Amino acid sequence: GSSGSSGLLYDCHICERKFKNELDRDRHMLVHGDKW
Ligand SMILES: [Zn+2]
């Protein structure tokens, strides 16, 4: 059993893509929020 020294911390609830910061994920949610 093995695991990496680093990883992605934040996740999209629309398309399951992941990010290093809350900011990087939060501005990605705008690509889904455009479908108003
Ligand atoms: Zn997404």
Swiss-Prot record:
Native source organism of the sequence: Homo sapiens
Q: Which domain of life is it from?
A: Eukaryota
Q: What does this protein do?
A: May be involved in transcriptional regulation. Overexpression causes down-regulation of a number of genes involved in the immune response. Some genes are also up-regulated.
Name the tissues where it is expressed.
Isoform 1 is strongly expressed in placenta, spleen, kidney, testis and peripheral blood leukocytes. Expressed in CD4+ and CD8+ T-cells, CD19+ B-cells and CB14+ monocytes. Isoform 3 is strongly expressed in placenta, ovary, tonsil, CD19+ B-cells and CD14+ monocytes.
Q: Which residues of the full protein are shown?
A: 402 to 430 of 1243
Residues in C2H2-type zinc fingers run 10-32
Q: Which residues bind Zn(2+) 5?
A: C12, C15, H28, H32
Q: Where in the cell is it found?
A: Nucleus; Cytoplasm, Cytosol
Write the protein's name: Zinc finger protein ZFAT
